Amino acid sequence: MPGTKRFQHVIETPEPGKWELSGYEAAVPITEKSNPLTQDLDKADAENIVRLLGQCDAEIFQEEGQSTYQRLYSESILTTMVQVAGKVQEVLKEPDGGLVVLSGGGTSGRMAFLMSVSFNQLMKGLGQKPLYTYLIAGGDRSVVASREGTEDSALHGIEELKKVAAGKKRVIVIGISVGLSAPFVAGQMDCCMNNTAVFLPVLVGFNPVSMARNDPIEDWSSTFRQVAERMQKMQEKQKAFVLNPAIGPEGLSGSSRMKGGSATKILLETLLLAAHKTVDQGIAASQRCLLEILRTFERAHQVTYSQSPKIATLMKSVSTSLEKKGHVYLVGWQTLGIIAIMDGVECIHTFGADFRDVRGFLIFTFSQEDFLTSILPSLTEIDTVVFIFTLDDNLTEVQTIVEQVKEKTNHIQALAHSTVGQTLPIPLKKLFPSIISITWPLLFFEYEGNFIQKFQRELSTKWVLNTVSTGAHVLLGKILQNHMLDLRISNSKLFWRALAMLQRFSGQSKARCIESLLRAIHFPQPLSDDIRAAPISCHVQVAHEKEQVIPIALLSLLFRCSITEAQAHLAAAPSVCEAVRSALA
Numbered sequence: 001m002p003g004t005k006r007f008q009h010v011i012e013t014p015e016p017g018k019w020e021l022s023g024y025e026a027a028v029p030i031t032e033k034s035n036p037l038t039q040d041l042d043k044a045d046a047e048n049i050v051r052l053l054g055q056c057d058a059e060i061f062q063e064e065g066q067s068t069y070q071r072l073y074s075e076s077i078l079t080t081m082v083q084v085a086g087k088v089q090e091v092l093k094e095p096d097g098g099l100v101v102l103s104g105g106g107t108s109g110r111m112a113f114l115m116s117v118s119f120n121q122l123m124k125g126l127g128q129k130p131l132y133t134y135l136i137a138g139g140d141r142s143v144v145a146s147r148e149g150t151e152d153s154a155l156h157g158i159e160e161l162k163k164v165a166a167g168k169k170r171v172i173v174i175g176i177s178v179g180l181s182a183p184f185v186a187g188q189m190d191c192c193m194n195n196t197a198v199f200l201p202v203l204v205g206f207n208p209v210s211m212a213r214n215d216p217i218e219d220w221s222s223t224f225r226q227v228a229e230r231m232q233k234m235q236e237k238q239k240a241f242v243l244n245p246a247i248g249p250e251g252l253s254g255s256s257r258m259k260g261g262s263a264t265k266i267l268l269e270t271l272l273l274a275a276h277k278t279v280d281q282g283i284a285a286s287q288r289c290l291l292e293i294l295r296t297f298e299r300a301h302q303v304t305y306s307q308s309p310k311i312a313t314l315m316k317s318v319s320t321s322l323e324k325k326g327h328v329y330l331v332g333w334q335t336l337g338i339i340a341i342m343d344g345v346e347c348i349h350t351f352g353a354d355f356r357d358v359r360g361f362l363i364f365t366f367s368q369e370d371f372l373t374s375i376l377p378s379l380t381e382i383d384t385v386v387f388i389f390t391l392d393d394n395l396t397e398v399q400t401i402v403e404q405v406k407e408k409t410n411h412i413q414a415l416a417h418s419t420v421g422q423t424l425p426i427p428l429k430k431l432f433p434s435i436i437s438i439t440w441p442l443l444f445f446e447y448e449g450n451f452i453q454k455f456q457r458e459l460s461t462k463w464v465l466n467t468v469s470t471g472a473h474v475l476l477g478k479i480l481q482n483h484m485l486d487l488r489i490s491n492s493k494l495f496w497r498a499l500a501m502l503q504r505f506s507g508q509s510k511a512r513c514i515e516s517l518l519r520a521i522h523f524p525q526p527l528s529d530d531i532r533a534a535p536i537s538c539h540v541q542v543a544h545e546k547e548q549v550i551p552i553a554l555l556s557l558l559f560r561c562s563i564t565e566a567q568a569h570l571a572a573a574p575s576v577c578e579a580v581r582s583a584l585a
């Protein structure tokens with residue numbers, strides 16, 4: 001009928017109690033699943049939250065069980081990492097007309113960028129011409145902006161890839177898509193496979209290829225799945241690679257900026273860094289070289305989360321300022337500044353939060369006085385300001401800005417990375433009572449700017465800020481179990497996530513859920529046959545513009561009532577969250 005093929009991939013809602021037996025749950029990609037550790041995340045207190053997310057993040061390093069999915073430390077994955085290091089080496093050997101592209105949408109795009117800078121530094125440090133570049137969905141703008149809608153075009157991905165691949169002779173394209181989902185990457189990988197002579201595609205994400213996305217893409221004929229299955233066949237001739245360890249679901253379902261983006265760095269820093277370091281040695285990269293690095297990253301988690309109580313406290317101070325109407329400033333230097341910006345921006349689409357709510361800053365890119373003059377006066381009793389640096393930074397720029405802020409505000413916890421026995425000027429730097437002191441062992445490093453210390457630190461900061469930003473909002477009651485129900489539908493993936501949440505929470509048929517959603521989106525216009533049959537991009541473009549789409553749609557279903565009736569109920573309840581939870585009751 002009208003809309004049958006648009007919605008064909010959607011599995012029917014199972015009956016009460018048979019979610020397993022129907023096998024609907026077997027087809028939910030690992031990346032979208034509900035993480036059982038966080039079933040009650042919306043009841044956890046701050047310290048619980050930090051523990052549950054610490055646990056979730058730990059799952060990245062968990063090893064393979066005895067009929068089950070390959071993981072980071074499984075031999076197949078490390079062997080693929082080794083082969084890829086190899087191919088990166090051939091390019092490094094012969095940089096003339098060589099290029100290495102790291103590409104993704106959203107947080108995969110952000111991760112791509114950091115890493116292309118890092119490995120560009122590393123080659124500058126050795127006086128080699130930089131061979132790395134990034135590509136992000138929607139151009140460079142996207143690195144530091146919330147722009148969730150730009151991932152949905154395969155021709156845009158191919159366009160962007162054709163720009164930077166110029167008249168290069170040998171190009172490595174690392175397509176990063178956590179969910180093995182983004183149309184932006186799918187076209188790139190497919191294009192590479194059509195010109196092997198020049199391109200080598202390497203696909204990175206965290207689902208088995210059997211769970212790769214498989215609904216049609218509006219500007220492209222193949223699906224992500226087909227593209228990935230065909231890359232996997234090519235791997236046997238070593239002309240494509242798929243690097244896809246399971247890392248377990250996200251503690252907030254489908255919030256792939258968290259574990260997904262973490263594991264992206266872990267996986268890609270590790271392997272690239274191996275390729276470089278072993279290329280100067282005239283040795284092949286080996287599982288043993290990768291393992292040293294992976295184990296360092298695994299220590300980095302333990303190191304990071306041992307500071308848990310201070311993490312729960314910072315969370316509680318971020319949650320408080322938001323619970324009033326304050327604002328949160330993440331102030332950090334060099335790449336940890338960026339990471340802070342990245343975190344704050346991602347809270348907009350992730351939690352429906354305003355850009356002032358949690359906002360990052362680098363010394364978005366403001367100077368010492370500049371921040372003192374412009375941003376400083378706007379601060380207030382109820383806010384929180386977070387400072388993020390190493391002892392190697394310029395603590396005379398640091399101490400100044402804190403002095404200033406300690407006046408206009410008092411909540412000013414802070415995040416300081418140190419190699420052991422660095423001290424921390426001003427013993428009267430009880431400007432911060434009990435800092436988040438993270439001190440790193442000494443470790444070997446032959447390269448110039450100590451790249452492995454950078455990677456550790458960036459990851460540990462990412463983990464802290466993510467757990468913080470995410471916990472603060474959970475505490476405010478905005479998360480339903482371990483799902484963000486009331487999200488903004490701004491891309492096709494988010495539209496499927498919405499439809500999925502409608503089925504799960506209502507228990508009602510696929511057809512009713514779809515109808516309640518489309519009515520909610522297009523109200524006041526009734527359901528027509530054109531609307532039923534529209535490409536999903538038409539629903540997205542209309543929903544993106546509205547508020548409470550999903551909660552309205554869910555109420556209409558639970559109450560078995562019209563959109564006019566559910567909007568009126570909603571507006572009569574004290575709050576969205578209360579309207580929904582009590583309707584669910």
Ligand SMILES: Nc1ccc(S(=O)(=O)N2CCN(c3ccc(C(O)(C(F)(F)F)C(F)(F)F)cc3)CC2)cn1
Nearest residue numbers: 029032033034179181212213493496497500501504
């Ligand atoms: N690899 C991929 C990635 C995305 C897609 S998708 O965009 O078509 N869609 C994403 C959301 N998705 C989904 C999300 C959440 C659920 C849930 O059922 C649960 F519990 F599993 F999270 C929820 F309750 F959230 F709805 C179920 C399915 C199914 C597939 C398909 N394959």
Ligand SMILES: O=P(O)(O)OC[C@@H](O)[C@@H](O)[C@H](O)[C@@H](O)CO
Nearest residue numbers: 106107177178179182255256257
């Ligand atoms: O890497 P994927 O699966 O292609 O996801 C790409 C982006 O949608 C994703 O990074 C998203 O922006 C984040 O808000 C998810 O928390």
